[PDB]
Design a protein around this ligand. Structure first.
Ligand SMILES: *[C@@H]1O[C@H](CO)[C@@H](O[C@@H]2O[C@H](CO)[C@@H](O[C@H]3O[C@H](CO[C@H]4O[C@H](CO[C@H]5O[C@H](CO)[C@@H](O)[C@H](O)[C@@H]5O)[C@@H](O)[C@H](O)[C@@H]4O)[C@@H](O)[C@H](O[C@H]4O[C@H](CO)[C@@H](O)[C@H](O)[C@@H]4O)[C@@H]3O)[C@H](O)[C@H]2NC(C)=O)[C@H](O)[C@H]1NC(C)=O
Ligand SMILES: *[C@@H]1O[C@H](CO)[C@@H](O[C@@H]2O[C@H](CO)[C@@H](O[C@H]3O[C@H](CO[C@H]4O[C@H](CO[C@H]5O[C@H](CO)[C@@H](O)[C@H](O)[C@@H]5O)[C@@H](O)[C@H](O)[C@@H]4O)[C@@H](O)[C@H](O[C@H]4O[C@H](CO)[C@@H](O)[C@H](O)[C@@H]4O)[C@@H]3O)[C@H](O)[C@H]2NC(C)=O)[C@H](O)[C@H]1NC(C)=O
Ligand SMILES: *[C@@H]1O[C@H](CO)[C@@H](O[C@@H]2O[C@H](CO)[C@@H](O)[C@H](O)[C@H]2NC(C)=O)[C@H](O)[C@H]1NC(C)=O
Ligand SMILES: *[C@@H]1O[C@H](CO)[C@@H](O[C@@H]2O[C@H](CO)[C@@H](O)[C@H](O)[C@H]2NC(C)=O)[C@H](O)[C@H]1NC(C)=O
Ligand SMILES: [Mg+2]
Ligand SMILES: [Mg+2]
Ligand SMILES: [Mn+2]
Ligand SMILES: [Mn+2]
Lengths: 420, 419
């Protein structure tokens, strides 16, 4: 019945990017930059990267920002891997139109292998997933793109799992589907071959030793056409955490919208929304939704968030709260394209950890590629409590604002607030 | 494979009860009282009544109100039918606990047949339906209970369909299920016998001649265990109207709650709520929900109504609006038990009419008995526009209030306002 357990000494580390000038007067996590540099320096045999886009340099973004140095160093170290014998495979989303690929050209010339995946053709989605698998042993999974802005100008949340080969090998099965689909002539197979299958899923998670105590872990993926036998869909894994919570659900995600954003005519998509309403009304669960806001936020988000916030009622014990996280910007930072936003995508409850790559609207679960890590672990003081502390740090910070906040007071453009 | 059309000269009349003191300047339907007295006077062979409870007299309600006299006259006329040869059959919900039944005892003594239906035992619900079928030819369907207060002290909305035997016989099939289950030793049959089945439903409605022009009509019923082959469930019919609307949905219902109420564990029930959200967001449908409010209103409705009201956004063209209809009550009116509230339960769109007996929460569609009339009819005017005109009269009146209105300022106690 149950699959084999894992004997590897798995260790998980939450890693963040904190934008320049964002201050939290309190503990510290290793930075995305530091963690990535360490992974690269120790890579000896293989590196697989699932990626959305590559802008690791100032030239890529047509900027002259000092704070692009960290991404430029990442690209410099990446270029050293293939010449020293590491097998580098990079899957990247096919861009919407003509676009130079200076980073990937440089990596190809160093000996890395690169394939573009045309998710638009295959599923009408895009390859939005961000992860690394290093020597079939460690992996990074999280919000940070292959982007210098993802290190110093955008807030990111991810995890690095070290020394955990069983789960690294499991994640590689998700990578291999991108790798297969990046080849000329590819199409979605009606049945994925058995070597894509996994035994480790919602019904039977992987038993691992995580920081020296037992834990249950599995990896979910999207979209459904890429799901082989045994692989839990991302949406199912997410809703299972929501449905199982009995005390609180804390969600930090850049975008939340109960719609199929890009499909015509536009379509209502209440899967997650009704899950949250069911949790608070049926089980008294305290729901806190921390949504990001910047100049590029879809303004239709505001009415849907107000609709959830209205479900606060002392007598039913319904208790959903919404705040908007806004990264401030000064004049120089405002000139950097697509920067100064909180990019995290995660959920934590009193009993479970969910760390994802996708924003929370319907296309990310039906058409677009993504991956999430799901962990449960008995006891206190582990990965789950560390992620809860990050959430509460952000939730309580001066960068989080109620929906009635004056837009002219938050330090960056925010479309989801009124002038009132 | 379409079923036979009806050849009867069907004629529909909307009938209301307007509580004493409720004024609408310059807005003219026969009252429930008048319509019921007309049906009783003309009845020559049969009267079937589905009913929730009977309090047609002052003594029933322990009051001394002159406005009870219309209900008392209805009871006096009901007592004349069986002695004159009319077969009277009355189905009534079994009360929660012991209660006197003065009205039904008087009707039994006159020769009427009365059966009490234990819906609590059968389905964990109650027999909430209100309708009359007269001479297998006419019927009343609507919100009014067999209650003197339903004539003069509560606002009611119903319809009388005259001269329409095909549809009246169709409604009797729903009555016959109540009538069977009100017999000692009854149980829900695993399959209902064929004589309960109907051919007229959402997929193939009855073709009738309604006020001289073609129309499509059918009758939906609740709960599912009482549905024989062919009978559309109330919830399916309701959601079909919501899902087919392309311009507006106007709903006037006493209670709206997206829950399976008084269930513990509490159960969320978004069937209708999500249909309205889908309509406004996907199709740009303008939704107006007119919910009643009084001192007995369940206070948890407020958060769910505010949650719908938040979905108004210029650029998505989402446009849901909520108001509360409050019937004023002075200190004398407030001494009357369970009065001074708007009882209507109906929905109208730019293309369809829905008139029901149930409030809009989950138990009414899963466990409790109810019935609704569904009509579509090509053309301007008609029943549909008459019901729309009633809705807008109420919506625009000084008795309808936005959810940010002070609770001091609506003329009666209202639990859904913050003050
Ligand atoms: C499961 O197991 C794993 C593996 O063991 C555990 O992960 C470990 O967690 C440790 C936390 O106890 C963590 O410890 C470090 O965390 C922080 C990261 O330090 C890094 O950055 C520092 C600062 O870098 C800035 O400054 C330098 C110079 O000042 C600049 O060059 C640079 O550009 C930056 O601007 C460096 O100084 C470090 O050398 C390191 O590179 C640090 O904050 C920690 O140090 C201090 O932390 C406390 C409180 O924050 C201070 O009060 C105290 O003085 C410490 O000096 C510390 O170095 C481990 O790094 C991490 N391991 C790995 C491999 O990442 C999981 O926690 C565990 N989970 C459980 C138990 O649930
Ligand atoms: C499909 O066909 C059906 C069948 O014909 C149509 O139904 C008919 O609709 C008619 C509407 O034009 C309607 O006509 C009358 O409607 C009103 C109701 O009249 C009744 O009540 C009056 C009220 O008087 C009482 O008022 C107080 C209230 O506090 C009482 O306490 C007290 O007892 C008073 O007596 C009575 O006076 C009437 O005798 C009657 O019982 C009336 O207001 C209408 O009268 C006005 O209009 C006429 C001419 O239009 C004027 O001459 C008059 O002076 C008034 O201004 C009117 O008589 C029919 O009653 C109704 N038929 C049935 C059987 O119900 C549907 O409308 C049709 N649908 C469509 C879409 O076409
Ligand atoms: C992953 O496993 C390696 C072993 O392969 C760990 O490295 C050892 O760490 C201990 C404690 O710091 C040292 O005593 C050993 O000398 C190290 N050996 C080697 C070969 O490096 C490493 O610390 C583990 N990583 C994490 C994050 O737990
Ligand atoms: C229901 O059917 C009866 C029977 O035809 C209709 O009553 C007739 O109406 C005409 C037209 O006004 C009168 O001239 C006749 O005298 C009536 N006959 C009888 C026996 O009453 C009646 O109008 C129909 N519609 C309604 C709403 O009752
Ligand atoms: Mg999915
Ligand atoms: Mg039903
Ligand atoms: Mn769980
Ligand atoms: Mn319709």
């Amino acid at each position: 019945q149950r699959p084999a357990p894992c004997y590897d000494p798995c260790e998980a580390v939450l890693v963040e990017s904190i934008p320049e000038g964002l201050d939290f007067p309190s503990t510290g996590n290793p930075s995305t930059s530091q963690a990535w540099l360490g992974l690269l320096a120790g890579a000896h045999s293989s590196l697989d990267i699932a990626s959305f886009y590559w802008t690791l340099t100032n030239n890529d973004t047509h900027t002259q920002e000092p704070s692009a140095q960290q991404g430029e160093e990442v690209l410099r170290q990446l270029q050293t891997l293939a010449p020293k014998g590491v097998n580098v495979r990079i899957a990247v989303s096919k861009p919407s139109g003509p676009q130079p690929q200076a980073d990937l050209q440089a990596l190809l010339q160093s000996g890395a292998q690169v394939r573009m995946v045309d998710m638009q053709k295959l599923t009408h989605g895009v390859l939005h997933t961000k992860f690394w698998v290093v020597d079939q042993t460690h992996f990074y999974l999280g919000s940070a793109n292959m982007d210098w802005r993802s290190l110093t100008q955008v807030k990111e949340l991810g995890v690095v799992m070290y020394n955990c080969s069983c789960l690294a090998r499991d994640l590689t099965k998700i990578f291999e589907a991108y790798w297969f689909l990046g080849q000329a002539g590819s199409s979605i197979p009606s049945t994925w071959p058995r070597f894509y299958d996994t035994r480790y899923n919602q019904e039977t998670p992987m038993e691992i030793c995580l920081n020296g105590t037992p834990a249950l872990a599995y990896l979910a993926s999207a979209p459904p056409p890429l799901c082989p036998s045994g692989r839990t869909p991302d949406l199912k894994a997410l809703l299972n955490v929501v449905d199982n919570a009995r005390s609180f659900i804390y969600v930090a995600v850049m975008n939340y919208l109960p719609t199929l954003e890009f499909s015509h005519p536009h379509r209502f998509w209440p899967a997650i929304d009704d899950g949250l309403r069911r949790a608070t009304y049926e089980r008294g669960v305290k729901v806190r939704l921390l949504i990001s806001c910047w100049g590029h936020s879809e303004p239709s988000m505001r009415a849907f968030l107000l609709s959830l916030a209205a479900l606060r009622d002392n007598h039913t014990h319904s208790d959903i709260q919404v705040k908007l996280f806004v990264v401030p910007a000064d004049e120089a930072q405002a000139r950097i394209p697509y920067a100064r936003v909180n990019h995290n995508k995660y959920m934590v409850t009193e009993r479970a950890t969910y760390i994802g790559t996708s924003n929370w609207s319907g296309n990310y679960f039906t058409e677009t590629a993504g991956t999430s890590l799901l962990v449960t672990q008995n006891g206190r003081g582990g990965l789950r409590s560390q992620l809860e502390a990050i959430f509460l740090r952000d939730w309580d910070s001066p960068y989080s604002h109620d929906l009635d906040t004056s837009a002219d007071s938050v330090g960056n453009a925010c479309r989801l607030l009124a002038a009132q």
